[PDB]
């Protein structure tokens, strides 16, 4: 439907919060190289990341890394809507916790 | 602090001890990356503590050192060098001359090694701005470059404001203020901070303990609000306070007990500007909140 739901392509960069966006993508959409926009995924999966400017690494498709797809619970080529996320301020007291299956083996304050 | 930082702290302590009992003017410089890391750590540690600190009794609190390396060294030799004794300067810890840098470095090193045995405060003479205190900004501009000066200014702004001795004696720079209401807004006022021209902290740092006023009035700084005897009495009654420290003045006796031994105007400024032979003194606070007048040379 809306053009904002660009195809979620594969990103060569291993950075999770970086999406290789085409020059046409960075231009037609209000997508600067340092714009913190919000992407909406499946089952109300909303996240804010950075939009990298890579014209040669994207052809009308948001090149997204596998880590980004796993975190957002989305597949490749998905038409994911992207909206600006300028309301993301510094958290006051954010509770965090490691994953037992993922923090198993990393001793100490890992 | 850190391994390089702790080594530099030990070297500075040794240099100050070797410059102890001699003429003032020590500098105690360092490297570039090491000094940057030490300044960052000191800013983080000072900003970590609240604006209203608490003293650890017993302690040997000095008056206004006026940025004197010789006076600080004499206080360390007599009142107890760090970390063997807790030091809490009332204010005006930095002033004109090339000897305030050594005192600041020694205080930072002592706080890094033992934060419970090191404390200092600023008044009208140790303000963060060259308009009220040019004995730091102008000295740094003449000696060092601007990046280190900016780092030092940020670290000083990231420091605490007041201190208390077992909730008995207030370790203030000057006198009371009419703008100071309670400790809730004092502890809430975190880094950064500075001594203003008028207000509450401005009256604490620039103004002194006034008796010609009742609630508020003019001060010696010309903009500060030197709270009178009535204001100080009301603040002490409401806050259950008993003593308030006063500094940033040329005291002929060094330690003056005002407000009926409720304002110990201890001043460690010896021979202020040469012409004004102000006496030096310290407030020897025992373990049982026993404030003693530890006078020193003028």
């Amino acid at each position: 439907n809306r053009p904002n739901r660009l195809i979620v392509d594969e990103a060569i960069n291993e950075d999770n919060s970086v999406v290789s966006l085409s020059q046409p993508k960075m231009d037609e959409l209000q997508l600067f190289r340092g714009d913190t926009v919000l992407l909406k995924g499946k089952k109300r999966r909303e996240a804010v990341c950075i939009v990298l400017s890579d014209d040669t690494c994207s052809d009308e498709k948001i090149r997204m890394n596998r880590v980004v797809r796993n975190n957002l619970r989305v597949r490749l080529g998905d038409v994911i809507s992207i909206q600006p996320c300028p309301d993301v301020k510094y958290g006051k007291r954010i509770h965090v916790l490691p994953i037992d299956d993922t923090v198993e083996g990393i001793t100490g304050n890992l | 602090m850190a391994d390089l930082d702790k080594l530099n702290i030990d070297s500075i302590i040794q240099r100050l001890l070797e410059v102890r009992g001699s003429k003032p003017g020590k500098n105690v410089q360092l490297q570039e990356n090491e000094i940057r890391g030490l300044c960052l750590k000191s800013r983080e540690i000072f900003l970590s503590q609240p604006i209203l600190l608490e003293l650890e009794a017993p302690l040997k609190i000095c008056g206004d050192i006026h940025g004197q390396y010789y006076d600080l060294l004499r206080l360390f030799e007599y009142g107890g060098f760090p970390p063997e004794s807790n030091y809490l300067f009332l204010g005006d810890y930095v002033d004109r001359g090339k000897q305030s840098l050594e005192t600041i470095c020694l205080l930072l090193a002592y706080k890094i090694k033992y934060p419970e045995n090191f404390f200092l405060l600023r008044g009208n003479h140790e303000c963060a701005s060259i308009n009220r205190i040019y004995g730091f900004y102008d000295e740094c501009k003449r000696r060092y470059n601007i990046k280190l000066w900016k780092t030092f200014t940020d670290c000083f702004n990231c420091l605490p404001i007041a201190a208390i001795v077992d909730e008995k004696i207030f370790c203030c720079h000057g006198g009371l203020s009419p703008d100071l209401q309670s400790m809730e807004q004092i502890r809430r006022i975190m880094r950064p901070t500075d001594v203003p021209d008028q207000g509450l902290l401005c009256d604490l740092l620039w103004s002194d303990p006034d008796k010609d006023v009742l609630g508020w009035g003019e001060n010696d700084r010309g903009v500060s609000f030197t709270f009178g005897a009535e204001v100080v009495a009301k603040f002490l009654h409401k806050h259950d306070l008993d003593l308030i420290c006063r500094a940033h003045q040329v005291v002929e006796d060094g330690y003056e007990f005002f407000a009926k031994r409720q304002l110990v105007t201890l001043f460690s400024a010896p021979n202020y500007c040469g012409e004004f032979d102000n006496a030096g003194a310290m407030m020897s606070v025992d373990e049982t909140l026993m404030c003693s007048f530890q006078i020193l040379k003028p």
């Binding site: - | 940057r36 102008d138 501009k141 601007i146 990046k147 040469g274 012409e275």
Partner: protein, 285 residues
């Protein structure tokens, strides 16, 4: 033997010996002294430095007789006036700043001089501030006058410092042939002159410059210190010009309105990796 340095720092004694007995004294230090001044200034002909801070004397002593002096540190004194300093043309250094100085004078000219500092005077009076032409470094900051006296005559100085100066009018900056260092913090000048003429400067100070863009910063591939403190910022064209070059080390934006989002700071840091330092926190590069 004769002492090579006279230290009177907080001596707590009105009389200082060894000034005439030790004619080899080269450092007559009386900083934060409890005495008025030091006598026998002309008695020791081989005197290099003479420090006198927090001096109780209201006037100088033998301020012109020491024609063989090298450093005259009369700074941070309580003297009413400083006179006779213009007579000694062989004084390689002079420090008489941060003092009372109710009459700043005797600073006309000198033959062999390298350092001069007689600012922070209670009277905004400057006499012949651009008379000599043998200096290589200039420190004209902290000027109590509302305007600069003369700056176009400095064409051989490789270092310019005019920081925190109340001289709102600052002209003649384009008359210098070359200057390795040029500090124009709080100079009161709308634009920086001499950027095309003195383009061999490795440092640049804007200090919240009213100019939107920087004067030829993209073609300036030699300035390693592009500092613009307390910026609004004026515009991003100066930022683009600075980002075009890669031979800069210290870059200050600084404290602009575009730093509210923490992502903006990270994006700016990623965009400009050629700058060794980023304003306050040095860029990881």
């Amino acid at each position: 033997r004769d002492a090579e340095d006279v230290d009177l720092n907080h001596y707590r004694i009105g009389k200082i010996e060894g000034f005439e007995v030790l004619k080899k004294v080269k450092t007559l230090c009386l900083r934060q002294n409890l005495i008025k001044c030091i006598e026998n200034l002309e008695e020791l002909q081989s005197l290099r430095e003479l420090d006198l801070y927090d001096n109780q004397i209201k006037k100088i002593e033998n301020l012109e007789a020491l024609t063989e002096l090298e450093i005259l540190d009369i700074s941070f004194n309580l003297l009413r006036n400083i006179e006779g300093v213009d007579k000694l043309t062989r004084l390689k250094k002079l420090f008489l700043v941060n003092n009372k100085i109710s009459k700043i004078e005797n600073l006309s000219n000198l033959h062999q001089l390298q350092m001069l500092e007689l600012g922070s005077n209670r009277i905004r009076a400057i006499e012949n501030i651009d008379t000599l032409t043998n200096l290589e470094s200039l420190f004209l900051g902290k000027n109590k006058i509302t305007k600069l006296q003369n700056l176009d005559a400095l064409t051989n100085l490789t270092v310019l410092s005019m920081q925190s100066n109340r001289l709102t009018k600052i002209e003649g900056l384009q008359n210098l042939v070359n200057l390795r260092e040029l500090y124009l913090s709080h100079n009161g000048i709308e634009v920086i002159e001499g950027l095309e003429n003195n383009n061999k400067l490795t440092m640049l100070d804007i200090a919240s410059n009213r100019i939107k863009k920087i004067e030829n910063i993209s073609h300036l591939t030699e300035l390693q210190e592009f500092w613009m403190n307390d910026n609004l910022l004026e515009s991003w064209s100066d930022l683009d010009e600075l980002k075009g070059a890669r031979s800069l080390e210290t870059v200050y934006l600084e404290r602009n309105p575009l730093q509210k989002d923490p992502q903006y700071r990270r994006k700016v840091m990623l965009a400009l990796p050629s700058v060794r330092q980023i304003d306050a926190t040095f860029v990881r590069f």
